[PDB]
């Protein structure tokens, strides 16, 4: 299988990257031509954040962290299913039973993280209600 | 060194269960009721909280029975396996094994059973499950395949021992036994 | 009430796929066929008067290792990687043009130039310790030391 | 002009001067890409794509995920080029000169009429021959799922 | 399978640059002690078209050529040089026959293979004509070992997987035989 | 050159920079295995490389989890 | 039985409600699982049959009578450790409830026992790397099981980084071996044991030397052991050495086939250096766990001399030493988990901050234990006297047997240094005995009611109220008399070690 046609494509796309950047740099009118008030550098008002107009100045939930952390074990489970795809016929029943076992052990992990509700954001800080109880004497 | 006759170097899972002695079932029963008892015995030894005996909650006793249900079976499975390997008393199983094989060869069926697994898959399966009971205390692995690498010579099932000729079984030459390595590579030398 | 003004962009996107596909199907087929006509440029371009209808060769996909051996074998017979020929006897140049590629077996550049990847307990001993290389050099020396017998 | 050398010299230049964690994560991506590209050509196209799918797609974007969580706060040109030049001189990883100067070939043969990809053979052996290696791996993956939750989960 | 190797042509010229591949020729012919043979000159498509007729005609020599390789015990290339020429001569015999008996039936079929990605499933109409012609004029038949006669794939009247695009020369030649022969 | 331990100059001054150096170090081991396996036409070396890539991923996840909890442990006032 | 029950415990623990009683009851389910594992193991595995060595699972795992000895030992020591987390170590709810605050504690321990028991059996470089990670990953999780603790998490971060570098060195040695030979199975490598670079197996050892805390790598182990909770340090400072030292012994068995002297000199350089640091290091220390970390390094140095010598007497020296040292280690740490009830309470100067993770942290917190509990003080005295090497305790026979193996192989220099290093280390074992008893007669009649044990409620005032729980007391007493009275059955035990073979045969 030849890939010299593919190589020229990758090279052209690499050339297309330089063209997109520089075409802006050669077609925009000179700062003097428009208003001359300054370049992007000195014009710090124009080169700044957007805060809807008013100038101002990540303790993320642990549930978000466990979403990203648990992505890695579940990704290596999916990527290790790749060898079974292109060899499903020649491993027969034996490799099919092994594959199912390879999935059951990982599912017991899915059960564990489903019961603990690890991914739920939860609301421990707020949403409290109480019963007004009179304390007659 | 207590050595006996090697019935099967890799006994099949279904065979190992069918060869349980009554005492093996007792060990499986004892293991099943031992684990819930061991939880109770600990509480009698020492209460988990407080200073007085308190029966553990029924939920713990159900999970305890399951854990002791596998452990009892594993102990039963390994003890039954030693007989096949020859490490234990296997005179009773040897006659029982010989009756089945001599019957099997007689019907021209394979002693080992027909197999979905091709030649490489049969031999590969044997490698995984041979001597796998030594680590059966760590993780399970059973011979559930009808392979042919059992560490025996099928010639030894032709000679008649004491109390066997009365069976009057006729054994054909192995070359005519269905699903054996000595009866498959007749057309091509690499295809069965 | 079907809006045709709304479907104008789709008819242009339909032409976008057709433009790319129409070119690829025809240009690649024509190039493969032309190079499968003969071993020189004065044959590939011209069509003879006594030649019959032209049989185009479509591009090949889903190949394996035999198609890399078949391609070079076809190259040595016709001058093209997908040439056509069904002569029961090959040319006498077929027996003296086998291409056997010789290439080096050195480790990747990153494995031996990265500021971090090259540092390792055993990679230093390969690079700075003579213990391994002096032992192996003995076997090379004893090759020529045994030609006397 | 083996341009793969110039990519690493730039990479080796920025590894000596990186200050924050943005550049440190950049050295990771700037190292896999030469690893992937030098595997795509030459040695193994299958493991170039496995690296992209498993390293870049899975373990690299996790680094930048936690860098946004952790924090973002806070040499001389002569010594660097002197060090890089000194690092550049001796690049022979092995000292078997004949093994590095003499080329070799292999001879193909037609005995293998059942031609299938490497990933076909790897699956053929991993799911049959070394099914213990495959099963322990799912066991190591299982421990991580439990291991991540016990380390990080608060309550 | 498009794995890089050290034994044939690789995917791209960038592989060659990394490996520093030299494509080396050897002008030296074989020594006169080995009697010469006329190498087969057919390309990929004609061989795949006539493969089952080479199997039908050279079956004894192919088996004997391989049995020499099995029993040479690693010295196969050197100790089977004489048995390897019978196979080359036998296969040249078949291609020479197809050129002098079924030239148009043969060419039509392997033009179809060169038109349909060298796949047998796409060229059944041309292939059926070639098999019928070869049988009457050389007695060779196509047989796929290991299955009953009634269940061979190339005789399947209604295949599940069929070519997407038709070969014009195949469809035209087929219906002509539906008049010449199906009387 | 590396016998003076130059690679210590190339590792940044954060705990996350150490984690990356461990990955780049192990990456060299896998690339070495892929190199040998392809030359020998041996798929057993490719099985090893596949295991090394999968095992090197699990090592990253555990290390980051420890680092993440290490970070929030300081920022654990949460008395708002 | 271990693996199957682990899945049941994983699922069941994630179902039932988070509580201490249920967490403590699940810890008693694991104590059964480990017990069940030992009964099934001993049933099928026998010394008489495993003598030849048996390949399992496509030759990936090879088991013989030397490995089989340690698997049973590992299972035994894991029972004595689980007894701590499964029962009361003090009985005071404040101190003890730490052991029951984590539900995955027993699960991670069960993960490690699978990792520990399979490591000595490995027979393939592909499975060597996988198994060593299974053990290594389980230790990092156990070190960080108390995720609220700042010191515990800081230690697991230090542990993970050092182990990651250690595992990379191990992985790189195997890759280099595969580069030279192209073979993965260890038995196939033995066919080329004369044709490969024997120093690439030494690079493998340098990775395993980091994981056992051997100098110059000793720095991290001392820091880690002095920061983790005493219940955690009781496990991570002993178990890895049980399974790695067995593996190191086997790798050295194969190495001595070619009998390369340069390999032995480098290892002797590390053994010699470690004895120096293991002895002189502990002289100036205040923390008890830092003291037992230097003590651990010295004993590992002794056990490597038996490994390095690697003769027929080296099997006996190693097999005996690894058993007696484990029981001594369990006995000492079990006592330190108990005698925390006698600590005084303030009603000041030096502002010593104590936490519930290490209630006993300084050596002078052992003060006057001869007064508060004389019987347990002698048990700690007997245990320390074994570490010193005073006969006829278990500790003497370990050093005596190690010396036989060392001198029989010509390691004269190392034998003398170990006898110098033993005496230097006696200084800081004697300090523990000085603190235990020497100020008895001045404090004999003192008015003590501010001890931690005096905050225990009075139940009835008529029934007898024992101060220490039942199970922990029986373990301490049993292991103290076994240490003390080994002379009675020593001859049978040693003759029971002559039979443990590693391809000796005939
Ligand atoms: C079936 C239901 C069941 O077995 O347990 C009920 C169990 C009790 O549910 P619950 O009402 O919430 O329990 C409340 C009690 O307090 C929970 O306490 P419990 O004591 O009542 O039940 C917990 C259970 C322990 O639960 C388990 O061990 C289930 C293990 C499955 C994994 O312990 C037992 O009761 C022992 C008897 C059943 C154990 C089954 C062991 C043989 C394996 C089959 O439910 C489950 O655990 C469901 C687990 C099954 C998940 C799906 C697995 C699918 C796998 C196959 C799919 C592909 C083929
Ligand atoms: C940290 C790492 C952890 C690693 C461990 C993780 C867990 C892995 C361990 C799990 C097991 C590992 C092995 C799995 C890989 C091997 C798969 C394989 O070989 O496929 C080929 C194998 C086909 O080979 P074959 O030549 O056709 O042999 C036919 C029968 O298998 C055998 O024919 P037969 O002559 O033995 O008898 C046929 C008839 C029994 O015929 C009789 O003689 C009657 C016996 C009376 C009943 C005995 C009590 C039944 C059980 C109690 O049916 C049976 O009972 C066969 C036994 C299978 C029953 C369930 C076995 C559970 C074991 C687990 O595929 C199967 O049929 C396996 C079926 C069982 C499913 C797998 C069991 C686990 C799920
Ligand atoms: C589709 C084929 C329809 C057809 O051929 O005849 C109608 C169609 C013209 O529709 P029309 O002239 O508005 O119908 C007469 C009344 O004006 C129609 O006025 P109308 O508002 O009384 O039409 C009522 C009719 C809707 O009018 C229709 O008949 C369209 C129904 C087609 C539905 C599927 C498309 O019913 C509906 O409103 C409900 C239909 C929508 C139900 C959900 C869509 C079903 C899927 O004839 C054509 O095919 C030629 C125009 C189509 C565009 C061709 C050029 C595309 C732009 C290229 C550049 C120039
Ligand atoms: C059948 C599988 C589940 C067992 C459930 C049946 C059972 O044993 O009940 C639990 C037992 C008595 O049930 P109990 O809770 O007292 O009655 C309801 C009061 N609310 O409470 C107990 O004392 C526990 C007795 C356990 C009996 C053995 C359970 C074996 C479970 C199957 C294991 C293999 C699967
Ligand atoms: C467990 C169920 C066991 C019963 C069973 O169905 O398996 C037996 C079956 C044998 O089928 P058979 O055609 O008789 O094989 C001999 C042919 N010469 O074996 C088979 O053919 C297929 C076995 C598949 C059963 C596995 C399904 C369990 C889930 C896998 C995990
Ligand atoms: C298609 C091209 C994509 C790359 C475009 C950027 C190219 C610029 C050169 C950087 C890439 C070289 C590879 C080595 C990494 C070096 C990263 C670094 O040190 O910082 C570079 C960038 C600019 O900062 P600089 O002034 O150069 O350094 C001092 C700043 N305090 O500091 C920054 O972080 C600014 C944002 C740059 C983010 C780049 C992300 C890392 C690169 C990944 C994409 C390219 C992958 C590597 C390919 C080449 C490998 C040699
Ligand atoms: C509790 C201790 C249980 C001891 C069980 C030891 C055992 O059963 O195996 C002994 C083992 C010999 O076994 P083997 O040679 O392989 O052949 C026979 C197998 N049927 O011999 C061995 O080689 C095992 C080596 C480890 C032995 C450790 C010594 C045991 C220490 C006793 C600790 C007692 C603690 C007090 C228990 C309190 C309980 C509340
Ligand atoms: C593709 C886009 C097609 C339509 C947009 C073309 C407009 C750009 C032309 C231009 O820039 O012409 C004006 C220019 C220079 O004059 P300026 O105003 O300073 O240029 C602004 C851009 N510089 C300053 C970056 C160059 O003249 C030439 O260089 C004449 C040639
Ligand atoms: C075939 C022989 C089997 C013998 C029995 C073995 C199991 C022990 C349980 C007995 C019942 C029980 O626990 O009874 C309870 C007693 C007494 O407890 P206490 O301290 O007075 O607590 C206070 C009791 N109140 C509540 C009445 C006040 O506990 C014991 O004496 C425990 C003895 C230690 C265990 C011995 C095992 C030795 C292991 C040796 C192998 C290495
Ligand atoms: C078919 C067909 O109509 O193809 C004619 C094509 C494109 O058709 P279209 O209707 O824009 O396809 C879009 C179909 N949507 C509506 C599902 C998006 O247009 C011409 O070539 C003119």
């Amino acid at each position: 299988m030849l890939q010299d046609l593919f190589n020229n494509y990758v090279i052209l796309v690499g050339i297309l990257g330089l063209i997109f950047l520089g075409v802006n740099y050669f077609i925009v009118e000179s700062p003097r031509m428009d208003e001359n008030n300054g370049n992007i550098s000195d014009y710090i008002e124009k080169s700044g954040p957007f805060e809807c107009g008013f100038s101002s100045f990540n303790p993320i939930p642990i549930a978000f962290i466990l979403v990203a952390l648990l992505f890695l074990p579940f990704d290596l489970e999916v990527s290790s299913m790749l060898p079974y795809i292109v060899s499903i016929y020649s491993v027969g029943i034996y490799g099919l039973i092994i594959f199912i076992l390879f999935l059951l052990i990982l599912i017991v992990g899915f059960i564990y993280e489903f019961n603990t509700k690890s991914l739920s954001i939860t609301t421990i800080l707020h949403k409290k209600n109480k019963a007004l109880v009179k304390n007659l004497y | 060194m207590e050595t006996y006759e090697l019935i099967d170097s890799d006994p099949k899972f279904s065979r190992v269960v069918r060869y349980f002695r009554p005492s093996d079932y007792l060990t499986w029963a004892l293991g099943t009721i031992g684990a819930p008892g061991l939880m109770v015995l600990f509480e009698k030894i020492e209460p988990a909280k407080g200073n007085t005996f308190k029966m553990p909650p029924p939920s713990i006793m159900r999970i305890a029975t399951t854990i002791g249900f596998f452990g009892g079976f594993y102990y039963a499975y390994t003890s039954s396996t030693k007989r096949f390997w020859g490490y234990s008393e296997n005179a009773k199983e040897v006659a029982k094994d010989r009756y089945e094989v001599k019957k099997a060869l007689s019907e021209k069926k394979s002693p080992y059973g027909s197999s979905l697994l091709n030649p490489y898959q049969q031999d590969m399966s044997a490698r995984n499950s041979t001597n796998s009971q030594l680590l059966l205390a760590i993780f399970p692995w059973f011979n559930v395949a009808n392979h042919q690498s059992h560490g025996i010579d099928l010639r030894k099932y032709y000679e008649v021992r004491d109390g066997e000729e009365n069976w009057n079984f006729t054994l054909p030459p192995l070359d005519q036994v269905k699903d054996l390595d000595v009866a498959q590579y007749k057309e091509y030398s690499n295809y069965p | 009430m079907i809006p045709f003004e709304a479907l104008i962009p789709y008819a242009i996107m339909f032409a976008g796929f057709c433009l790319g596909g129409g070119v690829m199907n025809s240009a690649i087929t024509a190039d493969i066929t032309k190079r499968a006509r003969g071993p020189n440029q004065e044959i590939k371009r011209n069509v003879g008067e006594d030649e019959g209808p032209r049989n185009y060769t479509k591009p090949r996909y889903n190949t394996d290792q035999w198609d890399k051996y078949f391609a070079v074998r076809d190259l040595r017979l016709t001058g093209s990687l997908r040439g056509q020929s069904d002569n029961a006897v090959a040319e006498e140049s077929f027996k003296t043009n086998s291409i056997q590629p010789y290439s080096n077996t050195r480790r990747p550049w990153v494995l031996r130039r990265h500021i971090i990847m090259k540092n390792s307990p055993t990679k230093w001993a390969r690079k700075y310790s003579s213990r391994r290389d002096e032992r192996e050099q003995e076997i090379k020396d004893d090759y020529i030391r045994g030609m006397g017998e | 002009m083996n341009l793969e050398i110039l990519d690493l010299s730039i990479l080796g230049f920025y590894s000596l001067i990186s200050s924050n964690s943005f550049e440190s994560i950049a050295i990771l991506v700037a190292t896999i890409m030469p690893v992937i590209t030098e595997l795509w050509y030459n040695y193994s196209q299958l493991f170039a794509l496995l690296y992209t799918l498993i390293y870049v797609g899975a373990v690299v974007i996790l680094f930048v995920f936690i860098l946004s969580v952790i924090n973002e706060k806070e040499s001389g040109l002569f010594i660097l080029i002197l060090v890089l030049l000194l690092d550049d001189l001796d690049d022979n990883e092995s000292n078997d000169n004949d093994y590095n100067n003499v080329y070799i070939t292999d001879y193909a043969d037609w005995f293998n009429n059942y031609n299938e990809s490497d990933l076909s053979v790897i699956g053929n052996l991993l799911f049959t021959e070394y099914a213990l290696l495959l099963l322990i791996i799912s066991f190591i993956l299982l421990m991580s799922i439990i291991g991540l939750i016990l380390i990080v989960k608060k309550d | 399978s498009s794995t890089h190797t050290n034994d044939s042509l690789n995917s791209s010229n960038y592989v060659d640059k990394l490996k520093d591949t030299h494509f080396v020729f050897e002008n030296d012919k074989l020594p006169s002690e080995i009697p010469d043979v006329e190498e087969v000159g057919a390309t990929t498509a004609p061989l795949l078209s006539a493969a089952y007729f080479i199997g039908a005609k050279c079956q004894d020599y192919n088996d004997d050529f391989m049995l020499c390789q099995k029993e040479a015990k690693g010295n196969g290339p050197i100790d089977c040089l004489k048995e390897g020429r019978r196979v080359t001569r036998c296969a040249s015999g078949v291609l020479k026959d197809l050129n002098t008996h079924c030239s148009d039936e043969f060419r039509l079929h392997w033009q179809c293979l060169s038109f349909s990605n060298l796949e047998y499933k796409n060229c059944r109409k041309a292939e059926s004509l070639l098999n019928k012609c070869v049988f009457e004029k050389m007695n060779l038949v196509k047989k796929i070992p290991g299955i009953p006669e009634d269940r061979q794939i190339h005789l399947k009247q209604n295949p599940v997987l069929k070519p997407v695009a038709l070969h014009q020369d195949s469809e035209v030649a087929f219906k002509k035989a539906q008049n010449e022969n199906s009387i | 050159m590396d016998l003076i331990l130059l690679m210590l100059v190339a590792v940044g001054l954060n705990i996350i920079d150490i984690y990356i150096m461990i990955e780049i170090l192990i990456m060299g081991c896998t690339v070495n295995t892929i190199y040998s396996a392809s030359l020998d036409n041996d798929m057993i070396g490719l099985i090893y490389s596949l295991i090394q890539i999968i095992i090197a991923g699990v090592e990253s996840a555990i290390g980051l989890s420890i680092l993440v909890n290490y970070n929030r442990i300081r920022n654990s006032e949460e008395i708002e | 039985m271990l693996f199957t029950s682990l899945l049941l415990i994983i699922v069941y623990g994630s179902l039932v409600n988070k509580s201490h009683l249920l967490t403590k009851l699940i810890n008693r389910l694991g104590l059964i699982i480990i017990i069940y594992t030992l009964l099934i193991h001993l049933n099928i595995n026998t010394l008489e049959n495993l003598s030849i060595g048996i390949n399992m699972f496509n030759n990936l795992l090879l088991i013989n009578s030397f490995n089989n000895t340690i698997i049973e030992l590992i299972l035994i020591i894991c029972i004595l450790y689980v007894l701590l987390i499964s029962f009361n170590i003090t009985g005071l709810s404040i101190i003890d409830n730490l052991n029951y605050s984590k539900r995955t504690f027993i699960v991670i321990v069960l993960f490690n026992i699978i990792g520990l028991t399979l490591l000595p059996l490995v027979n393939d470089i592909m499975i060597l790397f996988i198994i060593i990670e299974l053990q290594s990953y389980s230790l990092y999780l156990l070190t960080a099981i108390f995720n609220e603790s700042h010191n515990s998490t800081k230690s697991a971060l230090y542990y993970f980084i050092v182990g990651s570098i250690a595992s990379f060195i191990i992985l790189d040695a195997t890759v280099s071996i595969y580069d030279d030979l192209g073979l993965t199975n260890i038995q196939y490598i033995l066919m080329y044991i004369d044709k490969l670079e024997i120093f690439d197996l030494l690079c493998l050892l340098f990775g395993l030397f980091i994981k056992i805390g051997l100098a110059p790598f000793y720095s991290y182990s001392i820091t880690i052991y002095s920061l983790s909770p005493t219940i955690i340090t009781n496990y991570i400072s002993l178990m890895p050495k049980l399974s790695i030292l067995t593996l190191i012994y086997i790798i050295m068995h194969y190495i001595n086939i070619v009998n390369n002297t340069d390999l032995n000199y480098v290892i002797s350089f590390l053994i010699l250096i470690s004895m120096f640091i293991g002895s002189f290091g502990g002289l100036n220390v205040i923390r008890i766990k830092t003291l037992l970390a230097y003590s651990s390094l010295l004993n590992v140095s002794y056990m490597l001399l038996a490994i390095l010598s690697n003769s027929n007497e080296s099997i006996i020296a190693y097999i005996y030493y690894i058993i007696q040292y484990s029981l001594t280690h369990i006995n000492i740490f079990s006592i330190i988990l108990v005698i925390s009830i006698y600590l005084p309470i303030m009603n000041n100067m030096l502002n010593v901050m104590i936490t519930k993770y290490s209630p006993i942290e300084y050596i002078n917190q052992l003060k006057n234990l001869f007064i508060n509990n004389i019987f347990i003080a002698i048990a700690l005295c007997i245990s320390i006297f074994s570490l010193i090497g005073i006969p006829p305790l278990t500790g003497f026979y370990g050093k005596y047997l190690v010396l036989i193996s060392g001198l029989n192989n010509g390691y004269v220099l190392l034998s003398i240094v170990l006898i110098i290093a033993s005496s230097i280390s006696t200084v800081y074992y004697a300090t523990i005995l000085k603190v235990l008893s020497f100020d008895t007669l001045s404090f004999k009649d003192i008015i003590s009611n501010n001890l931690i044990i005096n905050t225990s409620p009075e139940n009835n005032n008529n029934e007898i109220k024992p101060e220490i729980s039942n199970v922990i007391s029986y373990v301490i007493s049993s292991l103290t008399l076994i240490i003390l009275l080994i002379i009675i059955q020593y001859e049978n035990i040693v003759k029971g070690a002559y039979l443990v073979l590693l391809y000796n045969w005939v």
Side-chain angles (χ1 to χ4, degrees), chain B residues 28-53:
Chain B
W28 190 355
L30 280 162
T32 302
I33 58 188
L38 281 179
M39 292 297 296
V40 166
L41 174 80
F42 299 161
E43 207 69 19
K44 174 57 183 169
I45 283 188
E46 173 163 8
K49 283 180 66 167
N51 303 326
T52 61
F53 185 98

Side-chain angles (χ1 to χ4, degrees), chain A residues 93 96-98 100-101 104, chain B residues 113-116 146 179:
Chain A
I93 180 59
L96 170 53
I97 295 179
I98 291 291
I100 289 191
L101 285 180
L104 290 179
Chain B
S114 67
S115 193
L116 282 349
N146 302 339
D179 283 336

Side-chain angles (χ1 to χ4, degrees), chain G residues 93-113:
Chain G
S93 74
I94 307 186
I95 293 185
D96 277 22
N97 262 6
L98 184 67
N99 308 332
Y100 321 133
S101 66
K102 304 296 168 179
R103 183 142 296 182
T104 52
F105 193 106
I106 183 71
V107 175
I108 295 302
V109 169
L110 288 183
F111 262 137
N112 203 35
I113 300 178

